[model samples]
Target: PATPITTLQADGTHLVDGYGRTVLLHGVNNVDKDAPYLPAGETLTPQDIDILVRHGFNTVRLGTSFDALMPQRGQIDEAYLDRLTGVVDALTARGMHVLLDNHQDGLSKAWGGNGFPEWAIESRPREWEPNPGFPLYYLMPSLNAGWDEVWGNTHGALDHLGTALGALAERVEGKPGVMGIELLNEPWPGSRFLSCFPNGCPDFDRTYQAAMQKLTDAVRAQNPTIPVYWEPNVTWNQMMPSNLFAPPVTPALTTADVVFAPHDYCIPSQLAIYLGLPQALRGLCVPQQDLTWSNIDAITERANVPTVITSFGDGDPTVLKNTLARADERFIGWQYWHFGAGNATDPFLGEVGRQLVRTYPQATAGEPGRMIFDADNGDFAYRFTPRAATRPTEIFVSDLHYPDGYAVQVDGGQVTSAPGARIVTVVADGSGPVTVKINRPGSAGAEVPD
Candidate 1:
């Protein structure tokens, strides 16, 4: 049986569950993007859901559509909505988190991206402006203009999108393990990003705030505790983290429950190295490449809001390692990109298992600190000060990663384990700061070493 996840709430810079311990949501985005219904009502199975449980994942970025959920303006598609509801129900039944993403990019499929049904994109006439490929769709003026024009106002299809979101929120309302909704995928700044710089571009920013505020309003109205996630302009924050940028989000858009989610991709994964083009950042090594990841934290810090790495990708082990390593180092939680049914660009995350079977503290009794893991020997550790919650702190372990068994040592608490729970519970005595390490406790098979 799968264990249940408590409701998650943001405290300071971390996401804490009902136990008041920090929750690290580690998983992937696996959803159908095309409108005709790809990851349909029955795309996943109980066994597929178990894949996440055994791997120690706490959530899945479930991709959703505007047109699919809302076939007509102000009208929710009951059939499609029921299909989406079923998927969320299955995940929650297994004690998994579901973050519905209004996933879109480069406008839509016709222009080579996923998101927005005909209701959002059909009305526009765009030219086949080309660029390096997937990530650089911003280079295409036609695609950028489509976004600017749509984001320009708060009525029509845009307002209809919010209605669908409110409808989604209502369906998943009070549902167990439902993390919240990510307003959109990597949203580009439209044509306006071309000239954005240090001072910032108010036109694009204003449009973004207006759009996000509407969606947040709709979702928050239904379930006030649900965390509504918003992403920054992908052109600056998604891939490189440098060059022109948008200003930090203002208070009007980022409310108390808002999570500053951003996607960061490096050159190899984006277009440059994949295209065999010259290096975008000359002297940067894998370690130095995570500047983008760190930069998102800075942006969130200024806004006084919590943040999450909603997306990041790379097929290379070293590349994925460096990215996950920084997120772990910063104690930032994230969802791995591209775990969809047919999306092969990035998946089969074996090395990703190393980082995935990390020091995830389901709850902490006190002021918490960073968590680290060494996948090689299955060495894992976490630091935190005890609070008065009385509730125990929880840590998750992967059956596949530690094919043997986990030997846990707690400094300020007692350890207890339950079979099928995949987690060990620790109760803090408040005698001192708490520290727990999870390592390969037993050696059985000479085994599945990546």
Candidate 2:
């Protein structure tokens, strides 16, 4: 029998679980093409779960498209259910939780989006394609210029999506470890700008509210205890119509058990201008503190509901570090944009899939710390503590990738590595400071904390 789920309190802060524990979600979004409809396969394997657990991730934002849920109009696919169930079984076995997300890139693939099925879109305007240099919306006018023709049509199609959610609830209603449901990925208004804003489209919010209400009600009818998440239309962009055009005081269109969910991406848009680098290398690196906090603080204040930065990341180590730090401070939880797509030969960010597979140590103190070193990938993460109350710790090293040519020094004194080990450790007396130096065969000696 599955463990019965209990919702403790609304608190206008967050949903408390049965144990009265405030669940701080830390997980990744898994979206593999091969496992398009289900959560089965290598991505959900035990090895993968072990890695995620070691990294402190307790939840997973399971991304699914409307099409994936209902492969045949009005009929749910059995294979899809099996695949999704397989994923749930694997995660539950590993003591992990999952939240189902109805994710879409634009609208549907037929509408030039990656999420919805081909049949959802009533029309596809050629102008919707990405312009050579312009951002996404600049091409929208050519795609669906009229308010009723574009967004209105899209909303009508989503009614079917509501039905799909109802069907999903029927299947997974009592499943253990199934946390919540996320409705819609990043909704766009097409050309119905005024609907999102006063001068843009007045009726847009009414229609959106109605549709979302139906969906929320559908899910609630099946699993009243489970929370439903709703993203602000137009990807939660402050400047977008979904944010600007809506009335000053919009009623709570969401169901009684709904939670406000939003996504944020805050990496510097133009690193070249700040770094004085060529355009080609503009994305090298930048401090993520300011960008992440600014957006989160503003969103939390505006929404007035406990917010979860559900999706963000392309696997840049710096971005990952900053994002985790910010999430700890601001939101109740977060889910990395993706996982499970990478290979040995590909670079970290380039193969987001692979980066998803390799687990890093959770940023907690005193745990069996992860050596932040990746010899095969030329990345290094190292930390050391002073030994005892009076001594400093000494570390001797040999480069695992180039074993024969390695040496180390502690606070300047030379040391030798063990015959076969990459590192040797010694405690230092507390009277003096601690330091480490590394020397590879042909390379100059480099000292840390000098």
Candidate 3:
């Protein structure tokens, strides 16, 4: 017999799983921006699953284009969805949660990018080719007008988008490991992009929130309880506070199931990489990158919703290390920028892979106060207050980091898992603050709260 599907929901600022444990997601985004718009030719092989699991990732933010989902306006493409489902099932089979991303770049293919179909856009000639690509292409006049069309609701683009998203929500409603549906990926504000800086973008924010409100209504009509994630304009990737407020849809039973997901990229680091600057210059972006998280903390407090960085790092190991460190400090969950490396063992990939495979608490039984991981020496510590619970706290210990195995120290809890196991399970012994520490088998203890 099969069991019921329990969707991941937002509780205050934390993401709680069906078991009611505060879950921390660590994963990569697998987005196919080209034609066919599917990962691994719409098939996720066993090796693919192994790479993620071995690296200790428990989530995958998978992307789908509107053009692929609804090619002929109102007609849904069952064939494409079937292939997408096959890929999602493959990941979920290995206990990975899938977040459906309605991804778009520079508006649509009609505007020198991908996502929206040619028919949906109000046409304009590509005045210039996408030289320098990405952030530059976003400034193209044609792309801006295309965004205006959708934001203005001209040609019913918003309605069509909502229908496409609503259908996707319905498809994954009862799926075992589905995370939620992200309404759009890095939406650009078209011509009003300048207004986003030095102050908030009130005008565009209003239109965008209303559009999200409409889409949320559509999604709820189909699957009322699945969490819906939304992103701010692409400019917010630079540590700017988002003027967005969560959709006013009343909460199902707890708080609203809306998540404020945004992308954070160190512009300086990205520029250095793009311009072939020396590797040493990459380290300089650390201060700006640190500010990015500080801004995220402020924005999350104002929005009053659970938040996650849906994308970060296509940079270097230095950038990855700093970004992960910031996330650990805030108890935030994140999905890395991408998962295209497959099983390569090159120097760049090896260094980055090691950082991703560090130890972390996968599920906490109570409220987590603080968690920290020192990648330099493979030392980790986590502290949380106990709550009445049905399951033990589970922590993932990566074999990649501790080849000779490791040891754990827990106060106010009993270790249930065998020594040297990859996952250390702990059951709280009483109603007191719990602290779990892990380090090399014979190494001296690292400092942590008492």
Candidate 4:
């Protein structure tokens, strides 16, 4: 079980973990966006870290504010930096990776969202009109102008933001489970925003790529190996207007393999489901089970890299169930939009959580075959070929649904229980495919064909 620090392979489509295994992270976002947000620190606790591990969560999209990280240009806030690092450390300590989301929306903190240090916003001011909602700003002039000024670096905002991220990257580089960094969250296109607002797009994608190239270089210069993820205008992927026809995207940075960390709030959901058409959700015409797909088909194709649906979560039941299924069918990784106040408030538990807390080949001894989990019945199955028998292939089994414990089956290998742990490791006997299944007590489980 020797794995180096997690890294994005040159192939531009695989994120390999420390154990030299291609890890598909499935986790939740932990944010702190002032009022009307994830309630900052109160939502996450030391116990939450333990809880995440027990429930089969493997990643945390930790959000940090630009205003907090840099109140003064070029001078990174050490205190805020340390606090973010603790969030990372807590998850990594429990064998979970962390993706630091340089969280922002609508440009600045005063704009009723999180981002830019107030000092950083030197041009155009913002005014949220009552009624018609805050999202109207995306179509307004103030937000557009603000985006233009920042991307243009009119008052040195880009350099300051880039400098702060570089500082953080250097500080957290080489840490175990420090997966990657999202340069910007839901980047807007300024005046170009409208070009891609409804359709006939590509203008916004160009602008987002413009700002992205600058930030990517800054981070790569600080730590060349750490992976970077960049997203386009969040509005582009809206379900109703459906940015499906949005123009093709090109590399915004020289850094290849930057994971496509786009948020999956497809249409009404805002949280992209990864598969199935948004309109179809209202109808349920598609096969709801293995809902295979992509909303940003053009964007990702142009980026030409591996994708992790970095932001997705909601209150709806069917939409939530299919989001995880979308990833499972494609072998893509993802991070649910939130880990809000937990329990009923948390969509990552109980019913949908059963689906989210899925069964995956945590670290395969060699090539992975097929892995599937049925949330309704607590049935799980996985198959992988072993390259070496010395290191055992481990699979994470959640105790969420099967609180009374589950059953395990290993083929062409030996499986063992620790009397109380969840992960089941298989010591393979040879080089062929080895399958493992954990079914709930009593009844013949949903036996998957290998």
Q: Which residue ranges in model 3 land beyond 4 Å of their true spot?
A: 1-6, 39-42, 127-131, 246-255, 275-284, 341-349
Candidate 1 wrongly placed segments (more than 4 Å)? 1-3, 38-42, 122-133, 198-203, 238-249, 252-254, 272-288, 341-349, 401-404, 418-421, 441-450
Best-first order by lDDT: 3, 1, 4, 2
Candidate number of the best lDDT = 3
- Candidate 2: tens digits of C-alpha lDDT, residues 1-450: 223333333335554455433344567787643226554344456666665654446678776667887766667676786777678667766656677888776455544455556565555556545532213532355444422343455445666777778777767776667777887776566664544543223355556556576678877777776677777665234333333213453454334555666665543432333333454442532343444356445545655555676776644443554455455444356788766633233223233333332212221111111133232332323333332321112222322234355444455222333643333443443434434434444544432211
In each prediction, how many residue pairs overlap at the backbone (N, C-alpha, C within less than 3 A)? 5, 19, 0, 11
lDDT of 3 by residue, 72-121 (tens): 87888888888788888888878788899999987787756788877888
Judged by lDDT against the true structure, how good is candidate 4?
Answer: 0.66
Task: Please give, for residues 1-450, the per-residue lDDT of candidate 4 as tens digits.
Answer: 322335445254556554556566788887777632333556567666666777777788888767767777667778677767776776777777788888886677556656887778865443543322245555556666778888677888888888888988998988857877898887766776556534535544565566777788898899887778766556544531223213344433456657777665435433233233364454441232222244545445654567788876554455675666567655678888667534433445665676778767666667666667888777887776676423466678776767677778778788864744577777877776777878777737665544
Cα deviation in Å at residue 290, candidate 3? 2.6
Q: Candidate 4: minimum summed lDDT over ten consecutive residues — where? A: 239-248
The weakest ten consecutive residues by lDDT in model 2 span 361-370
Candidate 4: stretches off by over 4 Å: 1-11, 35-43, 123-133, 197-200, 239-257, 270-292, 295-304, 341-349, 388-390, 418-420, 447-450
Q: What is the lDDT of residue 429 in candidate 1?
A: 64
**Whole-model alpha-carbon lDDT for candidate 3:** 0.78
Question: lDDT (0-100) at residue 399 of candidate 2?
Answer: 24
lDDT per model, in order?
0.67, 0.52, 0.78, 0.66
Name the 10 consecutive residues with the lowest summed lDDT in model 3. Answer: 246-255
- At residue 142, give the lDDT of candidate 1: 68
The TM-score of candidate 4 is 0.83
* Reference-based TM-score of each model: 0.85, 0.64, 0.92, 0.83
lDDT of 1: 0.67
